[PDB]
């Protein structure tokens, strides 16, 4: 694909997301979603192969179904209220349709399978863009319409997302599938805290985006897509493996790393609303995410797996391309716990 075409497709995806985030009209929000999907599909299919084609097909089908449900919700809300402005929806059925459509777009359980399937199908850069941006937009819409979200349905989907992400990531060995299940679990956390504090939702979104960017940039640097492929990186550049081990510890929520701040603030906020069973279950379920993070860390950094013979030539050569802002992502994803009270600025 031509570089100009690639950059204009990326700019069109970002334009669609910005249209969603700045529009006050439901029709314009739907237009933004449609533009985002339309420009996103070729980005997934950039590196042509059967896996990329299948991932793009599944993602397109899921997003088209979600967009149809979202438009139906918009029309139903218009019927009972005659309003197009994005505010508290005036019909419970329209709200249920909108919530299910946005959950399907975000990949929340039980609409999750496409997330690991597409993430394994597509390359590392495509997966990074997918996770980050395509979680950024629907969560913006949900934060806008939070005051009419049904707490029971939202919390049920969030808990299902957390459990399913933990179990799937526990079973998987492929790095992209592990990242997808981690994304599912973090989406569960954020949507669980959504009906109480959209500021906490945004804080968790920022921390998750930073950690995911750092992890995907490290994976791109190591050029590893499986566990065994990552197990050879210690013999070529052990710094990358150490930084990735620290990032993995952060993603599990271990103090005093950055990953503990979202869980801590979400638990506090949800406890303020006289909810204890849900925060306790959400905290206890994250141990599965921590377990498969630790299993990945054992293979890559804390131990030394066998290597091969051409790794000598790999030693002789040097990494040419540079991914700027990677050190900043590594710092911000591990060492921003003391700066927690900035969430008021985020407010």
């Amino acid at each position: 694909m031509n570089p100009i075409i690639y950059t204009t497709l990326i700019m069109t995806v970002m334009s669609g997301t910005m249209l969603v985030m700045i529009s006050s009209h439901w029709l314009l929000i739907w237009i933004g979603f449609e533009m985002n999907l339309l420009a996103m599909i070729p980005v997934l299919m950039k590196n042509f192969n059967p896996r990329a084609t299948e991932a793009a097909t599944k993602y397109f089908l899921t997003q088209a179904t979600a967009s149809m449900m979202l438009m139906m919700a918009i029309i139903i809300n218009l019927l009972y209220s005659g309003q197009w402005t994005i505010t508290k929806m005036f019909n419970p059925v329209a709200m249920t349709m909108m919530t299910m459509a946005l959950a399907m777009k975000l990949g929340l359980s039980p609409f999750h399978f496409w997330v690991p399937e597409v993430t394994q199908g597509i390359s590392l850069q495509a997966g990074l863009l997918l996770l980050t941006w395509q979680k950024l937009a629907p969560l913006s819409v949900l934060c806008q319409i939070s005051q009419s979200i049904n707490p029971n349905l939202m919390l049920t989907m969030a808990m299902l997302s957390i459990l399913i992400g933990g179990w799937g990531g526990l079973n998987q060995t492929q790095l992209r599938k592990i990242m997808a299940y981690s994304s599912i679990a973090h989406m569960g956390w954020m949507t669980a805290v959504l009906p109480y504090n959209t500021t906490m939702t945004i804080l968790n979104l920022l921390i998750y985006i930073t950690m995911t960017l750092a992890m995907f940039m490290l994976l791109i640097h190591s050029s590893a897509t499986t566990t065994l492929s990552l197990s050879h990186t210690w013999n070529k550049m052990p710094v990358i493996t150490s930084l990735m081990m620290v990032t993995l510890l952060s993603m599990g929520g271990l103090p005093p790393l950055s990953g503990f701040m979202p869980k801590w603030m979400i638990i506090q906020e949800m406890t303020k609303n006289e909810s204890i069973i849900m925060p306790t279950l959400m905290a206890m379920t994250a141990l599965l995410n921590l377990y498969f993070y630790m299993r990945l860390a054992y293979s890559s950094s804390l131990t030394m797996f066998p290597s091969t013979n051409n790794m000598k030539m790999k030693w002789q050569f040097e990494h040419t391309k540079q991914m700027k802002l990677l050190p900043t992502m590594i710092v911000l994803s591990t060492l921003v716990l003391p700066m927690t009270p900035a969430l008021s600025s985020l407010n």
Binding site: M1, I5, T12, S15, I31, M35, A39, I41, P42
Partner: protein, 174 residues
């Protein structure tokens, strides 16, 4: 009354039941064309002649490409029709019976569905007494896409250009 719009709505639902039972893409396109024409009739009765003719023309053009694509990529030795396959016929009969139950119950009594509440009375009664003069309100509202709706024109044109670029890129292969 004459129940013209209601009969057309029933035909619309029947065509949807057909192409959702999905015998083959040929008959699905036939059912979709029938549904588009009947919906054009419905909205013609409700007032929007331009919108009805527009949607009918758009779907007639769209199903033309689908015919060429199913002849090329979605055909088998024995294409399935509604009575050909047990599953297709079962789904078709299930849809027909569900529609029949809904219409019969709504006609007999004011049916309150588990989802919405529908009142059994006249689509003619729901209309409005007031009227315009020497211009079509639908036509003026649609033509306002250029005086008003500058943003909509921009986003739609960019979406179409990007769609052309996208269909160029996807089918590139290699």
């Amino acid at each position: 009354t004459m129940y013209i719009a209601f009969i057309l709505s029933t035909i619309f639902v029947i065509g949807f039941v057909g192409f959702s039972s999905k015998p083959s893409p040929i008959y699905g396109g036939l059912g979709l064309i029938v549904s588009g024409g009947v919906g054009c009739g419905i909205v013609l009765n409700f007032g929007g002649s331009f919108l009805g003719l527009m949607v009918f023309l758009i779907y007639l053009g769209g199903m033309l490409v689908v015919f060429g694509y199913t002849t090329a990529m979605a055909t088998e030795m024995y294409p399935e029709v509604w009575v050909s396959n047990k599953t297709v016929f079962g789904a078709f009969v299930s849809g027909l019976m569900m529609e029949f139950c809904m219409v019969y119950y709504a006609l007999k009594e004011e049916e309150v569905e588990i989802i919405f509440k529908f009142n059994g009375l006249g689509d003619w009664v729901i209309y409005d007494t007031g009227d315009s003069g020497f211009f079509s309100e639908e036509a003026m509202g649609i033509a306002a896409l250029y005086s008003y709706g500058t943003w909509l024109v921009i986003v739609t044109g960019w979406s179409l250009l990007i769609g052309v670029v996208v269909i160029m890129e996807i089918t590139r292969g290699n």
